[PDB]
Every structure is written in structure tokens, then in C-alpha cells.
Design a protein around this ligand. Structure first.
Ligand code: BHZ
Ligand code: CL
Ligand code: CL
Ligand code: FE
Length: 498
């Protein structure tokens, strides 16, 4: 079975509704469904299902010329009518897509002919093409598979145009994909991919050592990092670690005592020994982060000043703000109140817990009492949406989302970043500038607005950046070098070539 592989994922791929979110998995939606335009590593898009496009002078009306040779995997044609019908299906559920500003920008979509698709926007939104390139929601399912002329209430078969077809799924067991033998583009070398559902990282590593699976591919949570390092020395296996793809950080609640105080947030940003954290909890496998976005992120090379590990300075900042230590005690107090902060995280995530214990210890050394609140996922998501946290673990979203889409979403009240920022006097100005930057085509003004937003978020110490994390791979050697997709959340199975 040289052209069949077995891999794993912590959950099933879901129903593969192209227009909905969890329990659908972004990498599996991208295996079956395709965009008008495809994201590239240099930050551009190339023609995909749209072979070319034009736009009006005011940048609000766009017209795409679609390929005329593409079929859905069930034989039905892909054309401008089918594409228009998918946009209607997505936007009939608009409210759900509020995080993604293109969904509020699209005013009209219509098929002018079988090959001409016209999209009209509210404003000259600059990230238009990059948001059409995302895994969801602007993909394409055969309209025959709508339920009652819609997708927001479910689909029939998950029929896309892409290079893989879902063969079958068994909840809590496995998902099987096969190559689309009528694909309009390049045939994948691999014919069949089985996903074993294996939620625990330790069990994933055991499945690979026993040879039950051929490939693990994921972020820093993929398997235990000590095990990963050991596998990278084991000549029977192959391992890889990409260049960093996004940031992991704490979000600090500027609207909740005592993180509502700038001096407290500044002191916390000097309290953590990040290098030690990464060598201790992560096994030396990741990068230290000093700012929300790494300097290599577009529009984020700003010369922002790092807060290096400096307990002396953290203590001095707290002392100056009136948080001093009472005879007998190791925890500071101001106005009778102890310097106590709750750090919420997913209680069953061993790596998260690991990091939280380190953060609690480092902060105790400067006289902050961090209480760890480890809870199930739904509970932590609820806290993020509603600002019920002191500090929370968080992360950015990688290319092509960083920085524009991650910033865009800071305006949405049901997101952790809005909630963390809600206490800032300049929050309204930041949100107004985020709206401006997304529609600004004066390149000078666009860079100025990104520098201002990112600078204010850095100076206000809203985040405690921890690490810039990478994608990791463990594979049987016979699979060869495993590529990495331009979009951080996709897996390029079509590029694997034993
Ligand atoms: O991740 C979130 O904060 C929420 N999601 C929206 C934003 N995410 C992109 C995506 O999921 O397609 C960001 C995102 C980017 C990169 C990897 C994973 C991601 O989840 C899901 C959701 C949508 C509507 C209402 C509630 C939740
Ligand atoms: Cl999920
Ligand atoms: Cl402009
Ligand atoms: Fe999401």
C-alpha cells in the first residue's frame, strides 16, 4: 500500500459543511473544497477556480472570470451560478461570520454568465482576495447538496471540487479520504488517506511507535515534546520542525482588577523567564516571543521594545504602584487587596497546565499570587467570550490571518481580545483605526495605522507574548520530505510524494 497512508487527528473531520465551523476541521474542509483564488507563501494569491479578475476604479466592484472545465466530484458543473449560490448560502448565515470582515463587506454577488461572477463590496476592502482564499467559509459545495436551498441548517453529501473525496466517516473512530480521479488539476500521488481519531498526545506517539499510523502533522500540541526530541534522534523515524507560524501568549484583562492597572501588566511582562519556560515545558523546541506578532509578520517590523526577563524591575514597578509586601507575607497588597490573578486554561491539556505552573511560579517570585483555574474547553471558551478571566492562554492565527484578520476580530465583542482590551481608554480609537486600516489603499497610511494599533497594544501591555510556535512532523521515512502549506491551518497532503 505505497500510495495509501494512515495518520491521526484528535477528533473526526466533522460533516464537512464548507460554510460552518466546529465540529468541522479546517484542514479537511480544505481537502475537499476550493477557493476562487489560492493563497501563496509570499502573501499573494494566484488564480484558482477563478482564472482571472478585474475591479472597478473605486475598488468596490469585482468581476471574476471562472474556469470552464471544473466539475464537482459528483459530475455536476462548477460555474458562476453554483459559486453565486454558495455565496448566498454563506451570507444567509451572515451573523455567524461576523469575525470575518469580508462577510460584512459583501453587498451583492451575482452570476453575469456561466463564467462571469460579480462581487460588490461596501468599501474598497483591501484583504478581499486573501479572505476569499481562507479554508472557510467562502469555498464551494455542489448546490444540489444544499438542504432546502440552504447550507446553514446542514448539507447532504459533502461534494466539493477538490483533489480529495470523503469516502466514509465513523464518529470517534476514523475518517477515510480518497483521491478525486476527476479532479481538474494535478492528481495527488497518494490515493487513500485514513485519519485515526486519537485525542491524547501520548497515545498519538504510541500509535506511531507501534506503526499503527504513518504520519503525525500538527502544532506544538501534536505529541509530547520530549518524545518528539527523542524521535528526531531515532534513525528509524523522520521528524521535522517548521519555521514559526504564529504566537502563543497570555491575554491580560485590562477591565478586571488587578490586571486593569498598566503597572501590574508591565510588571507581569518582566516576570516570566520565557527562555526557561520554553526549555522546561516545551523542550527547547519553540522560539521566545517578545511582541504580539513576530517581526517577520507583514506590517509588524516596528522596532517595539521587548520586556526581557527581569524580576528586579517587575518588583520595582509593583512597589512604585503601591503593591508592597506586608510583614510575614510573600504576596503583595494595595488598599487591603492582595495581588491575586486568575489564569484560566483547559484543565486536561497537559502542556497548557505545565506552562501555567511555570507562569504561576515565576509570578510568585515577584509577589503576585496566580490561581490556576483548569476547566473543560466549553467553559474556557465561555470565559473568553464574556471577559470572565484575569489572564487566559491565547494565540494568533498564522498566515494569511496575521495580522489583518486577527486585528479585525479584536472589534468583535464575543472574542477574547475585545474582552481583554475592553478596559483601555483608547479602545474606541483602536477599533476605529482597525476599521480604517482594512479599507485604506494609501500604503503609507496603512503602515501608519498598523504601527499605531500594534504600538498601543504593546505599550498598554495587553498581552504577555510567550512563544512563536512551529508546525512539527513525525513520519515513516518512506514517505519522504513532508511539505508545509502556505496557510498554517491546512495540510498539503496533495504534495506528499513517496
Ligand atoms: O477561532 C475563533 O476564535 C472562532 N472561529 C473563528 C475564527 N477562526 C477561523 C475559523 O474558525 O474559521 C480563527 C482561526 C484561525 C486559524 C486557525 C484556527 C482558527 O479558529 C470559529 C467561530 C466562528 C463564528 C462564531 C464562533 C466561532
Ligand atoms: Cl474544533
Ligand atoms: Cl485610501
Ligand atoms: Fe476559529
Amino acid at each position: 500500500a505505497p500510495d495509501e497512508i494512515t495518520t491521526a487527528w484528535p477528533v473526526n473531520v466533522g460533516p464537512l459543511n464548507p460554510h460552518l465551523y466546529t465540529p468541522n476541521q479546517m484542514f479537511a474542509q480544505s481537502m475537499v473544497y476550493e477557493p476562487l483564488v489560492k493563497y501563496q507563501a509570499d502573501g499573494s494569491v494566484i488564480p484558482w477556480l477563478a482564472k482571472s479578475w478585474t475591479h472597478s476604479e473605486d475598488g468596490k466592484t469585482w468581476t471574476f472570470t471562472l474556469r470552464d472545465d471544473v466539475k464537482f466530484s459528483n459530475g455536476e458543473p462548477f460555474d458562476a451560478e453554483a459559486a453565486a449560490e454558495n455565496f448566498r448560502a454563506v451570507l444567509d448565515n451572515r451573523q455567524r461570520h461576523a469575525w470575518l470582515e469580508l462577510a460584512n463587506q459583501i453587498v451583492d454577488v451575482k452570476a453575469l454568465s456561466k463564467t462571469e461572477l460579480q462581487i460588490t463590496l461596501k468599501s474598497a476592502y483591501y484583504p478581499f482576495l486573501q479572505e476569499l482564499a481562507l479554508p472557510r467559509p467562502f469555498r464551494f459545495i455542489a448546490p444540489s447538496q444544499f438542504k432546502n436551498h440552504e447550507t446553514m441548517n446542514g448539507i447532504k453529501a459533502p461534494i466539493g471540487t477538490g483533489p480529495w473525496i470523503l469516502q466514509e466517516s465513523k464518529l470517534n473512530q476514523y475518517d477515510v479520504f480518497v483521491r478525486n480521479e476527476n479532479y481538474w488539476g494535478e492528481k495527488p500521488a497518494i490515493k487513500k488517506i485514513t485519519f485515526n481519531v486519537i485525542p491524547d498526545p501520548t497515545t498519538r506517539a504510541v500509535a506511531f511507535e507501534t506503526g499503527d499510523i504513518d504520519l503525525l502533522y500538527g502544532n506544538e500540541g501534536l505529541l509530547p515534546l520530549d518524545t518528539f526530541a527523542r524521535f528526531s534522534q531515532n534513525p528509524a523515524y523522520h521528524t521535522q520542525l517548521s519555521q514559526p507560524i504564529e504566537t502563543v501568549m497570555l491575554a491580560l484583562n485590562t477591565a478586571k482588577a488587578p490586571t486593569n492597572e498598566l503597572a501590574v501588566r508591565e510588571a507581569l511582562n518582566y516576570a516570566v523567564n520565557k527562555k526557561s519556560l520554553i526549555d522546561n515545558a516545551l523542550y527547547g523546541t519553540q522560539q521566545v516571543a517578545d511582541t504580539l506578532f513576530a517581526p517577520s509578520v507583514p506590517y509588524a517590523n516596528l522596532g517595539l521594545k521587548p520586556s526581557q526577563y527581569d524580576p528586579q524591575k517587575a518588583k520595582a514597578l509593583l512597589e512604585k504602584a503601591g503593591w508592597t509586601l506586608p510583614a510575614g507575607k510573600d504576596i503583595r497588597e494595595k488598599n487591603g487587596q492582595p495581588l491575586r490573578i486568575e489564569l484560566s486554561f483547559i484543565g486536561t491539556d497537559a502542556l497548557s497546565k505545565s506552562m501555567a505552573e511555570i507562569i504561576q511560579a515565576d509570578m510568585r517570585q515577584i509577589g503576585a499570587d496566580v490561581s490556576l483555574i483548569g476547566e473543560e474547553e466549553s467553559s474556557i471558551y465561555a470565559r473568553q467570550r464574556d471577559g470572565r478571566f484575569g489572564m487566559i492562554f491565547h494565540r494568533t492565527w498564522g498566515a494569511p490571518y496575521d495580522p489583518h484578520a486577527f486585528l479585525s476580530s479584536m472589534r468583535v465583542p464575543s472574542h477574547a481580545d475585545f474582552q481583554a482590551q475592553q478596559g483601555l481608554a483608547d479602545k474606541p480609537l483602536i477599533d476605529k483605526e482597525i476599521g480604517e486600516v482594512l479599507a485604506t489603499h494609501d500604503e503609507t497610511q496603512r503602515q501608519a495605522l498598523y504601527r499605531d494599533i500594534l504600538t498601543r497594544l504593546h505599550d498598554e501591555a495587553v498581552y504577555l507574548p510567550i512563544s512563536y510556535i512551529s508546525m512539527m512532523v513525525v513520519s515513516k521515512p518512506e514517505l519522504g520530505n513532508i511539505p508545509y502549506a502556505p496557510i498554517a491551518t491546512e495540510i498539503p497532503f496533495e504534495q506528499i510524494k513517496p
